[PDB]
Design a protein around this ligand. Structure first.
Ligand SMILES: *[C@@H]1O[C@H](CO)[C@@H](O)[C@H](O)[C@H]1NC(C)=O
Ligand SMILES: *[C@@H]1O[C@H](CO)[C@@H](O)[C@H](O)[C@H]1NC(C)=O
Ligand SMILES: *[C@@H]1O[C@H](CO)[C@@H](O)[C@H](O)[C@H]1NC(C)=O
Ligand SMILES: *[C@@H]1O[C@H](CO)[C@@H](O)[C@H](O)[C@H]1NC(C)=O
Ligand SMILES: *[C@@H]1O[C@H](CO)[C@@H](O)[C@H](O)[C@H]1NC(C)=O
Ligand SMILES: *[C@@H]1O[C@H](CO)[C@@H](O)[C@H](O)[C@H]1NC(C)=O
Ligand SMILES: *[C@@H]1O[C@H](CO)[C@@H](O)[C@H](O)[C@H]1NC(C)=O
Ligand SMILES: *[C@@H]1O[C@H](CO)[C@@H](O)[C@H](O)[C@H]1NC(C)=O
Lengths: 309, 161, 178, 328, 48, 49
């Protein structure tokens, strides 16, 4: 699921007017749109970094996995962060990164490594505490039992697990790898994220591309318009140019909002999902993955998240 | 000719504000000037010394006033949004040039958001800044046999609004 | 703001401008004001839909954390949920989330089963714990140690598969009486 | 919040204790710190030389008087611990009769607004670190261009100058002003104005936009080639007869008329419809030149409206020809 | 509960310019407006 | 002066319509009229009384 999106931000004037006071002086007569316009993006910007915190800062206190990784026979080495990478990231997400003029771009509030780092701890508490940490002081329970409880949570008596521990183990470890190449195999795997950035780029590049049309005016470079035309007559020319340029931006913003809310809708869904599917075990069948659910495994991604149900 | 400065220019056909520099682009010889993917003037060959000039607009951004609550102190700090400080104590950051701030190495929990994990607070006695804490670390002693079972408990109540 | 008109008042522009020439002047305020109005709508509508999404949440949430006990972790606020209490506020509702949270614990050592008569055991609802000497099994969200019995546990399979199952005794209520 | 004329906070004010003429930058601030009351007069105007309209005031103990005349200003006017600050009172334009005293003046929109506020004498050697407001006293409708002013006594005081800034004014619960803040003083303060709030909570707040201005202009051009062949038109050795006037079409080339400005060899350098200075910097389809020899008196005939034999029977120009002409 | 609205499609131009080359040739002064408009509609339809 | 009725008025230049009641407010002697915090005329002083 997407989680965030590129925190774009465009000023009022330096879009409409490339620092030509004449253009500015005419603009001020349209009242206060751009502030309204600019404020909208501002909120969009703030909402973004709000999204990520709402989906990741679900843990007050960070965790670390122990040095010796003896987990009854479960090889999470694919998902825990690896020291070898200088980004302290994990092999799975390492694939994910591999697989993926008038304006401004704000950086995210949270640095991507911290984004990973919450996921880092998020795993540990999921790994070496069970659901308990989601509700308060984390408690450490040896992982095989944590399965048993989840099995107990599916009308499956604890006997089955330890009875079949190795086969249960090897299946899970065997399963893990099939994800790694599955992401590697499918070129349309991450399309959901891949679309988002691709969409926004199409938005901004649309926004700039509009900057080169004439909108019922003589030409689209106002300086030449300022030169080739006397001001009072150029103003009428400029006025037309201001109009289209303006509400063209207007379109962009309205375009942005609705997308952002949709993300927010997706965002909370993930947060809800990352509470219920991760921080504990749900029972909403076909919500935490097809089939009866056990646990989850969040995994950081550009602008977005990946779950392992 | 001028380089490295916020200057107003025209190279024989095309106006624009910008900060020029000698690029390493090699055009094809017949061509003068270069344009970016989004249809914008991105380079011009100085027709006297046929260097390849990179156009970069004048570095700029918003300004937000670092402050504790006026309730606390009148002394503030200022953020200039992402310009190299030389283009403006000072403590540069990936979030911009943040004057009136002294960086600190010690990890501290975030209090005020800036960007790229940069947060600040009053100290003792002025305004500091730092790469923010990841949160407070709390490792837990796993074993294949260590179980932690609670003994007392509290019935909190919180107000989701 | 007159949207580029000569004057900002519809009354004056009717007089201070000639009527046929007024129309073109009039048009500007129309287009200006109208669009300005329209943007307010879209501004409102989007925010309204945003609220409705939020409303449903609470609408569910009350019908979740009040009319029942939603097992969804974090849905009724932090911690295991007990009950929620609505209180009316202007334009919105506040939710006292009476939630439950464990506080204090101790170290304990676990074995995921017990073998007594060459036969395996699994706790029906507890978990086997060690005060160092005497093993115990207890409900899994509050330290309430309890004695080993047949009644408190159950049996499946023998002791050749389970990892770390531990040699130990199990009691029978019946035998002391008979 | 209003943006108007004020003395900015923490300004750096001149202190006196011998009262020379002091100008009026944009507003007039004055306040006398003395219970002696000796300083009880002001002078207003621009020339201050009895030739221009002026304003006068005397702050008697009980007889307050205000005057608008062309007084013969005493160049060293004063009184004694003897009220003659001038030498004559002619062509009078207006008259009026009405412990720390502050007086703010402005000749605005042709009107003269004078504002006052009396506070006790509780200071020793500094202008008090306190705060209050100025209450309007009188607005005078007098159309005078005022550049300078001078105070009139028979002590010490302070004088600064008003400025065009932007302020926020916490109007009290009953219509007075208990505090105010400069917008443009300091970062913290500038926060309050944009937040339009008198007390900022803890956090971060975007305030303005930090933009770099263009420090200089610049323009460059290819090494200017293909100069139009002009020497073979002016410096040309031989010329034809007037009815055999040659037309030399000028093809794609660069003109550089700069030489014909700064070379008085020709006697007229006469252009029609276009200024000489604004044609060496233009572009056109092409150019056609007539190089020939006419009489020494055929000088005037080379123009529209000239209709002599040389004009009519040897070489004619249209009545609306756009170009130039030179005869030497 | 509603599930999906009627899949609706409207041309850039056929609406604005009902097949008048004199019209659209004046429209192409307006940048890539309409093409965006089709996208959203098309985006809606596939969404449906 | 007419009170408690929907009338048009002009007090020394203060144009507008509405209805006039004895405001409990307190001006300052020099002032003429109060305004809404949102910039709308709120009160006046009758030169008569
Ligand atoms: C804010 O100021 C009040 C004084 O009215 C004081 O009681 C309070 O502790 C202050 N709080 C902070 C966070 O400065
Ligand atoms: C800022 O200036 C320094 C000067 O050495 C330079 O090394 C650095 O690359 C500049 N910043 C960026 C983002 O390029
Ligand atoms: C933090 O430590 C590094 C390593 O010596 C040093 O370069 C830097 O100046 C230190 N900063 C502070 C605030 O101590
Ligand atoms: C359990 O023992 C470990 C190792 O001695 C220790 O780190 C941990 O704090 C102990 N737990 C408690 C609750 O004391
Ligand atoms: C737990 O790991 C230790 C590590 O040496 C091992 O000795 C012990 O046997 C393991 N637990 C069980 C029940 O086997
Ligand atoms: C006032 O001016 C003097 C000299 O011009 C200067 O030394 C002093 O710093 C100034 N005071 C302020 C507050 O700027
Ligand atoms: C409130 O009004 C009274 C008179 O009605 C006045 O004396 C008092 O000063 C006013 N309050 C303030 C804070 O000025
Ligand atoms: C232009 O003139 C400069 C003067 O030094 C010379 O170096 C350069 O080669 C010339 N280039 C052309 C294209 O004329």
């Amino acid at each position: 699921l997407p989680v965030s999106m590129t925190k774009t931000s465009v000023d009022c004037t330096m879009y409409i007017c490339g620092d030509s006071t004449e253009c500015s002086n005419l603009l001020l007569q349209y009242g206060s749109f751009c502030t309204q316009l600019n404020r909208a993006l501002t909120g969009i910007a703030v909402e973004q970094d709000k999204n990520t915190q709402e989906v990741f800062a679900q843990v007050k206190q960070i965790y670390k996995t122990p040095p010796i990784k003896d987990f009854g026979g479960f090889n999470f080495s694919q998902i825990l962060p690896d020291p070898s990478k200088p980004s302290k990231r994990s092999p799975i997400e390492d694939l994910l990164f591999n697989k993926v003029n008038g304006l401004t771009v704000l950086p995210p509030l949270l640095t991507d490594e911290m984004i990973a780092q919450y996921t880092s701890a998020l795993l540990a508490g999921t790994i070496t505490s069970g659901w308990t940490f989601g509700a308060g002081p984390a408690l450490q329970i040896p992982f095989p039992m944590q399965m048993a409880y989840r099995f107990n949570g599916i009308g499956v008596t604890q006997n089955v697990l330890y009875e079949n521990q190795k086969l249960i183990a090897n299946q899970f470890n065997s399963a893990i790898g099939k994800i790694q190449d599955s992401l590697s195999s499918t070129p349309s795997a991450l399309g959901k994220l891949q679309d988002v950035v691709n969409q926004n780029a199409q938005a901004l590049n649309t926004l700039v591309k509009q900057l080169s049309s004439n909108f019922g005016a003589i030409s689209s470079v106002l300086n030449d318009i300022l030169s080739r035309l006397d001001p009072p007559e150029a103003e009428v020319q400029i006025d037309r140019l201001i109009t289209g340029r303006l509400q063209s931006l207007q379109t962009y913003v309205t375009q942005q909002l609705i997308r952002a809310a949709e993300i927010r809708a997706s965002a909370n869904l993930a947060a809800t999902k990352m509470s219920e599917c991760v921080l504990g075990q749900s029972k909403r069948v076909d919500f935490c993955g097809k089939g009866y659910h056990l646990m989850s495994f969040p995994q950081s991604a550009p602008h977005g998240v990946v779950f392992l149900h | 000719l001028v380089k490295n400065k916020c200057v107003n220019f025209n190279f024989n056909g095309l106006t624009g504000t910008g900060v020029l520099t000698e690029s390493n682009k090699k055009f094809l010889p017949f061509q003068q000037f270069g344009r970016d993917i989004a249809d914008t003037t991105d380079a011009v060959r100085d027709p006297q010394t046929l260097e390849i000039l990179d156009i970069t607009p004048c570095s700029f951004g918003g300004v937000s006033v670092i402050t504790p609550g006026t309730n606390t102190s009148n002394q503030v700090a200022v953020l200039y949004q992402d310009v190299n400080c030389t283009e403006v104590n000072v403590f540069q950051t990936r979030a911009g040039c943040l004057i009136g701030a002294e960086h600190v190495n010690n990890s501290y929990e975030c209090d005020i958001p800036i960007g790229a994990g940069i947060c600040a607070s009053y100290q003792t006695q002025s305004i500091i800044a730092y790469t923010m804490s990841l949160g407070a670390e709390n490792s837990v002693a796993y074993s294949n046999n260590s179980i932690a079972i609670p003994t007392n408990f509290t019935i909190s109540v919180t107000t989701e609004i | 703001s007159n949207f580029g008109a000569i004057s900002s008042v519809l009354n004056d522009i009717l007089s201070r401008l000639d009527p046929p020439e007024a129309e073109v002047q009039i048009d500007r305020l129309i287009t200006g004001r109208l669009q300005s109005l329209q943007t307010y709508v879209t501004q409102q509508l989007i925010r309204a839909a945003e609220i409705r999404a939020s409303a449903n949440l609470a609408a569910t949430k009350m019908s979740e954390c009040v009319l029942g006990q939603s097992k969804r972790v974090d849905f009724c606020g932090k911690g295991y949920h007990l009950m929620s209490f609505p209180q009316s506020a202007p334009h919105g509702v506040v939710f006292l989330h009476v939630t439950y949270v464990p506080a204090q614990e101790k170290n304990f050592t676990t074995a995921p089963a017990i073998c007594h008569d060459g036969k395996a055991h699994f706790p029906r609802e507890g978990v086997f714990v060690s005060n160092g000497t005497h093993w115990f099994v207890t409900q899994r969200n509050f330290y309430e140690p309890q004695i080993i019995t047949t009644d408190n546990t159950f049996v499946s399979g023998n002791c050749d598969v389970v990892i770390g199952i531990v040699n130990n005794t199990v009691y029978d209520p019946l035998q002391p009486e008979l | 919040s209003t943006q108007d004329l004020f003395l900015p906070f923490f300004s750096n004010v001149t202190w006196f204790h011998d009262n020379p003429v002091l100008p009026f930058n944009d507003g007039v601030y004055f306040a006398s710190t003395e219970k002696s009351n000796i300083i009880r007069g002001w002078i207003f105007g621009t020339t201050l030389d009895s030739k221009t309209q002026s304003l006068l005031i005397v702050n008697n103990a009980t007889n307050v008087v205000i005057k608008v005349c062309e007084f013969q200003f005493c160049n060293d006017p004063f009184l004694g611990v003897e009220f003659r600050v001038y030498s004559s009172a002619n062509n009078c334009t207006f008259e009026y009769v009405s412990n720390l005293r502050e007086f703010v003046f402005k000749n605005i929109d042709g009107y003269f607004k004078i504002y006052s506020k009396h506070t006790p004498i509780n200071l020793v050697r500094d202008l008090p670190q306190g705060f209050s407001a100025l209450e309007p006293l009188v607005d005078l409708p007098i159309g005078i261009n005022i550049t300078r002013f001078q105070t009139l006594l028979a002590a010490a005081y302070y004088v600064g100058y008003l400025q065009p800034r932007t302020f926020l004014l916490k109007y009290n619960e009953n219509g007075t002003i208990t505090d105010a803040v400069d917008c443009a003083l300091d970062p913290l303060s500038e926060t309050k104005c944009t937040l339009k709030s008198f007390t900022v909570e803890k956090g971060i707040y975007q305030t303005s936009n930090f933009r770099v201005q263009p420090t200089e202009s610049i323009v460059r051009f290819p090494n200017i080639t293909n100069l139009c062949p002009f020497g073979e038109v002016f410096n040309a050795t031989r010329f034809a007869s007037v009815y055999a006037w040659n037309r030399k079409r000028i093809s794609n080339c660069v003109a550089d008329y700069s030489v014909l400005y700064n070379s008085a060899s020709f006697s007229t350098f006469k252009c029609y419809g276009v200024s000489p200075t604004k044609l060496n910097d233009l572009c056109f389809t092409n150019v056609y030149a007539d190089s020939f020899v006419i009489r020494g008196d055929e000088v005037r005939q080379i123009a529209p409206g000239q209709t002599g034999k040389i004009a009519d029977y040897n070489y004619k120009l249209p009545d609306d020809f756009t170009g130039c002409v030179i005869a030497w």
